[PDB]
Design an enzyme around this catalytic site. Sequence first.
Site, PDB file in Angstrom:
ATOM      1  N   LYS A   6       0.864  -1.167   0.000  1.00  9.21           N
ATOM      2  CA  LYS A   6       0.000   0.000   0.000  1.00  9.21           C
ATOM      3  C   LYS A   6       0.918   1.239   0.000  1.00  9.21           C
ATOM      4  CE  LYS A   6      -4.137   1.774   2.349  1.00  9.21           C
ATOM      5  NZ  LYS A   6      -4.966   1.624   3.576  1.00  9.21           N
ATOM      6  N   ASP A   7       2.051   1.160   0.703  1.00  9.87           N
ATOM      7  CA  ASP A   7       3.012   2.271   0.746  1.00  9.87           C
ATOM      8  C   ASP A   7       3.569   2.530  -0.663  1.00  9.87           C
ATOM      9  OD1 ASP A   7       2.931   3.123   3.397  1.00  9.87           O
ATOM     10  OD2 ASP A   7       4.626   1.900   4.048  1.00  9.87           O
TER      11      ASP A   7
HETATM   12  C1  LIG Z   1       3.498   1.485  13.194  1.00 15.71           C
HETATM   13  O1  LIG Z   1       3.392   2.006  11.853  1.00 15.71           O
HETATM   14  C2  LIG Z   1       4.269   2.080  10.679  1.00 15.71           C
HETATM   15  C3  LIG Z   1       5.707   1.852  10.874  1.00 15.71           C
HETATM   16  O2  LIG Z   1       6.147   1.576  12.011  1.00 15.71           O
HETATM   17  C4  LIG Z   1       6.651   1.909   9.733  1.00 15.71           C
HETATM   18  C5  LIG Z   1       8.119   1.637  10.112  1.00 15.71           C
HETATM   19  C6  LIG Z   1       6.221   2.202   8.436  1.00 15.71           C
HETATM   20  C7  LIG Z   1       7.253   2.260   7.176  1.00 15.71           C
HETATM   21  C8  LIG Z   1       8.093   3.488   7.044  1.00 15.71           C
HETATM   22  C9  LIG Z   1       9.402   3.710   7.472  1.00 15.71           C
HETATM   23  C10 LIG Z   1      10.214   2.610   8.198  1.00 15.71           C
HETATM   24  C11 LIG Z   1      10.195   5.034   7.291  1.00 15.71           C
HETATM   25  C12 LIG Z   1      11.600   4.935   7.867  1.00 15.71           C
HETATM   26  C13 LIG Z   1      12.667   5.785   7.409  1.00 15.71           C
HETATM   27  C14 LIG Z   1      14.002   5.828   7.792  1.00 15.71           C
HETATM   28  C15 LIG Z   1      14.619   4.874   8.865  1.00 15.71           C
HETATM   29  C16 LIG Z   1      15.052   6.773   7.225  1.00 15.71           C
HETATM   30  C17 LIG Z   1      16.411   6.833   7.872  1.00 15.71           C
HETATM   31  C18 LIG Z   1      17.168   7.774   7.140  1.00 15.71           C
HETATM   32  C19 LIG Z   1      18.398   7.917   6.552  1.00 15.71           C
HETATM   33  C20 LIG Z   1      18.692   9.240   5.837  1.00 15.71           C
HETATM   34  C21 LIG Z   1      19.565   6.921   6.489  1.00 15.71           C
HETATM   35  C22 LIG Z   1      20.949   7.551   6.234  1.00 15.71           C
HETATM   36  C23 LIG Z   1      21.627   7.241   4.949  1.00 15.71           C
HETATM   37  C24 LIG Z   1      22.985   7.238   4.649  1.00 15.71           C
HETATM   38  C25 LIG Z   1      24.093   7.593   5.693  1.00 15.71           C
HETATM   39  C26 LIG Z   1      23.564   6.846   3.281  1.00 15.71           C
HETATM   40  C27 LIG Z   1      23.174   7.643   2.076  1.00 15.71           C
HETATM   41  C28 LIG Z   1      24.384   8.005   1.341  1.00 15.71           C
HETATM   42  C29 LIG Z   1      25.145   7.302   0.403  1.00 15.71           C
HETATM   43  C30 LIG Z   1      24.795   5.869  -0.039  1.00 15.71           C
HETATM   44  C31 LIG Z   1      26.426   7.860  -0.320  1.00 15.71           C
HETATM   45  C32 LIG Z   1      27.122   6.914  -1.338  1.00 15.71           C
HETATM   46  C33 LIG Z   1      28.378   7.441  -1.980  1.00 15.71           C
HETATM   47  C34 LIG Z   1      29.101   7.083  -3.152  1.00 15.71           C
HETATM   48  C35 LIG Z   1      30.382   7.757  -3.658  1.00 15.71           C
HETATM   49  C36 LIG Z   1      28.698   5.968  -4.113  1.00 15.71           C
HETATM   50  C37 LIG Z   1       4.740   2.437   8.225  1.00 15.71           C
HETATM   51  O3  LIG Z   1       4.294   2.700   7.064  1.00 15.71           O
HETATM   52  C38 LIG Z   1       3.794   2.377   9.397  1.00 15.71           C
HETATM   53  O4  LIG Z   1       2.447   2.602   9.102  1.00 15.71           O
HETATM   54  C39 LIG Z   1       1.315   2.034   9.752  1.00 15.71           C
END
Ligand SMILES: COc1c(O)c(C)c(C/C=C(\C)CC/C=C(\C)CC/C=C(/C)CC/C=C(\C)CC/C=C(\C)CCC=C(C)C)c(O)c1OC
Lengths: 385, 110, 55, 93, 74, 62, 246, 62
Positions: free
Chosen positions: A228-229
Amino acid sequence: MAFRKSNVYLSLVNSYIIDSPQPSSINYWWNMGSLLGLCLVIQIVTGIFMAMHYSSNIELAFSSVEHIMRDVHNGYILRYLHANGASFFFMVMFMHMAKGLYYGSYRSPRVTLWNVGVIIFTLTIATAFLGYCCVYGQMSHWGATVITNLFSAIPFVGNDIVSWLWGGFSVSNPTIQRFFALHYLVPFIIAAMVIMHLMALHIHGSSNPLGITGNLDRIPMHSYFIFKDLVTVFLFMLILALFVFYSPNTLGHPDNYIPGNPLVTPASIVPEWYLLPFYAILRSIPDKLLGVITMFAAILVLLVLPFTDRSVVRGNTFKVLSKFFFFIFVFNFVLLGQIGACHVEVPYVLMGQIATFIYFAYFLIIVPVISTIENVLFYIGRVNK
Amino acid sequence: VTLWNVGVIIFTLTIATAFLGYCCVYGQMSHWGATVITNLFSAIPFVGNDIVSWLWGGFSVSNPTIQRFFALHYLVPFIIAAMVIMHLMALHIHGSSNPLGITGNLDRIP
Amino acid sequence: SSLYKTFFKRNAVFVGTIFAGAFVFQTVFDTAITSWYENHNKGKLWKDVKARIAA
Amino acid sequence: GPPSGKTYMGWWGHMGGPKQKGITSYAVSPYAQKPLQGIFHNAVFNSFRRFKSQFLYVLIPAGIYWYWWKNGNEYNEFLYSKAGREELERVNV
Amino acid sequence: VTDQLEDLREHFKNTEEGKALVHHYEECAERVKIQQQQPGYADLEHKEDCVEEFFHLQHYLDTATAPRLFDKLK
Amino acid sequence: KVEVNLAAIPLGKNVVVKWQGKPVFIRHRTPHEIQEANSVDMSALKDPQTDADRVKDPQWLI
Amino acid sequence: MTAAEHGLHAPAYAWSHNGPFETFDHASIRRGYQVYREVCAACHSLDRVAWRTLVGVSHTNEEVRNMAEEFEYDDEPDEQGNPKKRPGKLSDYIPGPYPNEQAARAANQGALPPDLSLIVKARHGGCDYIFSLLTGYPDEPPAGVALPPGSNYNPYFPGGSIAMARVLFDDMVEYEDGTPATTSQMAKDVTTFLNWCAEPEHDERKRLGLKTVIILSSLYLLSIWVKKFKWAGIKTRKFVFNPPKP
Amino acid sequence: KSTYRTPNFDDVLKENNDADKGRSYAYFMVGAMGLLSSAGAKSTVETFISSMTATADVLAMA
Ligand SMILES: COc1c(O)c(C)c(C/C=C(\C)CC/C=C(\C)CC/C=C(/C)CC/C=C(\C)CC/C=C(\C)CCC=C(C)C)c(O)c1OC
Ligand code: HEC
Ligand code: HEC
Ligand code: HEC
Ligand code: HEC
Ligand SMILES: CCCCCCCCCCCO[C@@H]1O[C@H](CO)[C@@H](O[C@H]2O[C@H](CO)[C@@H](O)[C@H](O)[C@H]2O)[C@H](O)[C@H]1O
Ligand SMILES: CCCCCCCC1=C(O)C(=O)c2scnc2C1=O
Ligand SMILES: CCCCCCCC1=C(O)C(=O)c2scnc2C1=O
């Protein structure tokens, strides 16, 4: 047991994304959270790749962004994605917040969940603003000037904190370079805060549109809500695509395509659309100190809602008076935004002042009064004595 | 074992981090180090020299190189932090070992 | 639809066949689009302008 | 592990709800159901219903705010035209 | 050749609507020069201009010439 | 420390110059403006100051 | 705010590049470049545009090479340290009429002709505004307007008083492609060329957009169908209650 | 009511003349979704990676 349950790392993923028991009746309003995580990723990824070609020096900042636009392969896609992404980040956040307001998501036992969310909102505003200053266009310079000056309102030391923040006599080379360093840092603090938000959500679970318990009928996150997401993730991408490729500058300001000038402030300054409601509130108070205090209070007042909601049931689904007033509040917010885009002229100043009053009155007067009245109505409509 | 393997990953990430930082000074050692380490990839058959010109962002270690190295030097430390958390999670399930090499379950202190 | 049962026979499509199809799609689609696009703007492009020029 | 605080949600098998009895659920596999196309003729006139009950709560507050905005705007336009430069000096400062 | 925009503007300044608009502007210009020749125009802080009336004219012209000017250009 | 050549500035015109990164306004005021400035009551000002307390030569607002 | 202050609203001309599926008209870009060189370049710089970007867009590799070589740029010092000049190459950026801001003002009553590289994106109205400003100079200002010495009146410019005089007059340019150089034809051309200067990625961006929007649209529709299928068991689920005896 | 008497599902059930009807549609849908998703992922990855290649302004032929 299954490996996904026993492994130290996989069990975390299993409990949060796979086996998490969700209330069978949640609607598409509950899809905004995942959309917010997606936005956070898009902002971090496109930001790091551009950072590879960006120079923070005040003499090179503006041109380095032009360099990203003209010379970097797919550079314009990166910039328009990052820029338009910030806007989409706020559109989705407001809907996430409004959803919480309407369904009483801020109520006990999810107060901690709501408070952490307020902190995230503040950190996001600070982040977008710092990013805005990195372009070093006309709007950038004056914004950096205004927001940093906001601190001079503090008695005694205020002007000191300001010269400190600037690292000099005015918004200059020490300012923009520290702003870039800071713009890179804050997003990782938001990420950590997002984890605490999720931890708080996990202890009691999601609420639902009926406002009552979900413990009698839950279904696994995996399959049902993952798919659904996906529906809204794609819809979100389609719309963002339309702006990025077909109308990349509609949500920006032409004045930012003009290099910052310390001696000239544009004849017409209109801040970022998502800051307009706050800009209007600031402008409505003919006093410096009181002006900034009321603006900050417009955000902190969100903390009061768990106490002023006197109702005995969670949410506005079965409440006539509350639904009605909920929408007065919504459109009043949009109005504040419209006032913010206008000049400080006659019908507008008074309209701005009344709208500001209404905004605060919703939290402090309307909600407690209405919820009490509704409690009584619910009672006398069924008790026969 | 998991505790030990995550630790190896951290060690690698730390080496990569310090090196990128070293390149940011852009002294004599910096330039040649950036040159040698990036060239390490040319050893890969067929595409190797391509990965290298890619990493450099040009004909040699230049302005696109050092700027991407700074961006990267800032990023990696936060990945080490996340890896350090996984290290601690793995440590928590069985606890610390001790100098005798045997169980600690019969006498622990807070 | 018996058209499906002839290629995959009551089973879903596997990753390998998906990845393979994706590589084919990427090329075919890009040509189809670049074509339609250039034809729609016939007369406005540099190709078209270069022909009307002689130096 | 360390003892955990009491919450209002458990997990599969001990969710925290009241003891259920007497309720019987029935379901049919999605595989045995009519391929998605029947969401019309039977599910079309039924739809749009969940907005005929709500639009008033949205329309009235919207209407109120739209007229208020239109009024103040048209007044502004007048004040800054030639005809209103007289009233402008009155309401301005 | 003669400028395509000026051609279209001229054509429109001569319609029933355009004439009505040039007239209102004309009546303003007239009223203005009379006010300038009188004593004390320099010190009045209420000097009238015909920008508003001019803008109405220009707007009408723009409205009519904008969707047609490019069909004539290359 | 910045030097501005006043002899160059026209009559009722505004000139802007840079001094310590901050903009410095300089207006060569007309006789009428000078009267308007020094004919205002303190009760109408939230920050009470005579035009005299602000300019050394009434012709130059700096 | 008074209309004179806001400025006359620029109307909507039918630019050939307006529309999701439309590219710039490269012939118009070519002509526009000539108008810029023969008229505008006298007072306006174009600092952000590099000679090489013209190749394959509005001119051939050869044509641009000839154009760049007519200008001199500072070369690397000789074997002894004395400075020396050099003709231009494709890597260079189109040179401007003035060596500094002060000399630019001196030559324009004290006004500063802005750089035109981003002008189209740096003003509300975009193309419609630039065109309208260029072709909107009336022979005489409206009655009552006290126009300052050295200024000009234009209704589209905010405040009406602009420091740039009308510079386009019929047949002041001899279009190499034969086209009649009327003032509106020339304005229409430079503006198009100025739009390209500010948004060189234009044509390519719109092509990529068409691909992106088709895939995402399809993905969106497909996901709905998949979701409904995966949900059918829960959706049509049915309950029955039979009160338990005490 | 008796739990053995299964409620009506006629409105939902497909008259099984073609048993593998819903399966073929669902599997095609999922398959096409996987196809287009992989193509998109490939394009996105390529967009970011190629942004690290030599910029237009540095490919000078000395
Ligand atoms: C109880 O209810 C829920 C529920 O609990 C959840 C979890 C969800 C689902 C949604 C989620 C889990 C959202 C979560 C989001 C996050 C954890 C985001 C965390 C964020 C970040 C930004 C991570 C950080 C990233 C990095 C450090 C790396 C990125 C950079 C890169 C790869 C550089 C690469 C470089 C080169 C040179 C190739 C639902 O839909 C929901 O509904 C009922
Ligand atoms: C020197 C004699 C000029 C020639 C030849 C052209 N322009 Fe100009 N332009 C000049 C000045 C002195 C100014 C400043 C105006 C002011 O009041 O600040 C300008 C300005 C412009 C602008 C910007 C206007 C704005 O909206 O701020 C534009 C868009 C512009 N000029 C365009 C333009 C073009 C395309 C020309 C050739 C056809 C042209 N100018 C010639 C001075 C001179
Ligand atoms: C270094 C990594 C980096 C991260 C992490 C990052 N940004 Fe940026 N951001 C930049 C750079 C570089 C710029 C300047 C280029 C540009 O203008 O897009 C920028 C610019 C901006 C701008 C100005 C957009 C414009 O108009 O040009 C905003 C707004 C912004 N960022 C918001 C965000 C938000 C919100 C997040 C995260 C939630 C974020 N950024 C994370 C690097 C980053
Ligand atoms: C001011 C409030 C607030 C902000 C801002 C906030 N959240 Fe939430 N969030 C909530 C509340 C309250 C809930 C509980 C919703 C419910 O169950 O009713 C919630 C629930 C969630 C959920 C569960 C699914 C859903 O949408 O209901 C996710 C995921 C989530 N939030 C992610 C985020 C992320 C990511 C951000 C931003 C970076 C964010 N939230 C910011 C208040 C907030
Ligand atoms: C290549 C291996 C390796 C590396 C590198 C590594 N660790 Fe460890 N770590 C271990 C092992 C194995 C243990 C278990 C020690 C024991 O109980 O005998 C451990 C235990 C720990 C402990 C428990 C106390 C102690 O010192 O025994 C902490 C805290 C810890 N590590 C932190 C870190 C941090 C922080 C880093 C680096 C950023 C790091 N480790 C890197 C292997 C590693
Ligand atoms: C983020 C990047 C996105 C990359 C692409 C997205 C992922 C695509 C995965 C595509 C195919 O992965 C494929 O899924 C189908 C299920 O639909 C699997 O099928 C499996 O389940 C189906 C359904 O019950 C069974 O019929 C089948 O016999 C069984 O093998 C198949 O074995 C697997 O190989
Ligand atoms: C929650 C913080 C709200 C921010 C309000 C500041 C808005 C704001 C101003 O008040 C201003 O004068 C200028 S000048 C250029 N940009 C801005 C701006 O964003
Ligand atoms: C695990 C990676 C070990 C790194 C080995 C590379 C060491 C190394 C070289 O081999 C070299 O030739 C130069 S020149 C300047 N610095 C260096 C350097 O650090």
